[PDB]
């Protein structure tokens, strides 16, 4: 169960990093 | 409990994926 | 630790709901 | 492990809080 939680957390970071790129590319 | 946390994280992940795609649609 | 984890989750739901409220206003 | 997960969730919460503020700035 713990490994499956860390997998979900890793994918959330990916989404967060991708959302940050969209915000950093709208701003400029 | 860990399995329930996993499901909630998976829903948060899908939440961020929809948020990311909407920002892409707004910007384009 | 388990109760504090659920506290952090509930706060994530709040931010997610506020983010979608910002997205709906930007989309419109 | 649970204490580290709480840190990860607290950091994700702070990421979403910053995203919310950036979206508010974009909306204005
Ligand atoms: Cu299981
Ligand atoms: Cu603050």
- Tokens representing D26 are 């974009």
CA distance C13 to D13: 9
For chain A, what are the domain ranges? 1-28
Q: What technique solved it?
A: X-ray
Q: Which residues of D touch A16 (CB under 8 A)?
A: 12, 15-16, 19
Cβ of B23 within 8 Å of Cβ of C23? The answer is yes
Q: Is B9 on the interface with A (CB under 8 A)?
A: yes
Of the candidates B8, B22, B26, which has its C-beta nearest C9's C-beta?
B8
**At what resolution in Å was this solved?**
2.1
- Closest Cα to residue B24, out of A21, D25, C3? A21
Query: Residue holding tokens 């939680």?
Result: A5
Residues sharing a CB contact under 8 Å with residue A16, sequence separation 6 or more, in sequence order = B16, D12, D15, D16, D19
Q: A12 C-alpha vs ligand 1 centroid, how far in Å?
A: 19
DSSP state of A11: H
Could you tell me the two tokens for C14?
A: 């709040």
- Three-state secondary structure call for residue C1: coil
Helix (H) or strand (E) holding A15, with range, is helix A2-27
Task: Mention every residue, 6+ apart, whose C-beta is less than 8 A from residue A4.
Answer: B2, B3, B6
């Amino acid at each position: 169960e713990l490994a499956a939680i860390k997998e979900e957390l890793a994918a959330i970071k990916x989404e967060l990093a991708a959302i940050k790129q969209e915000l950093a590319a709208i701003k400029q």
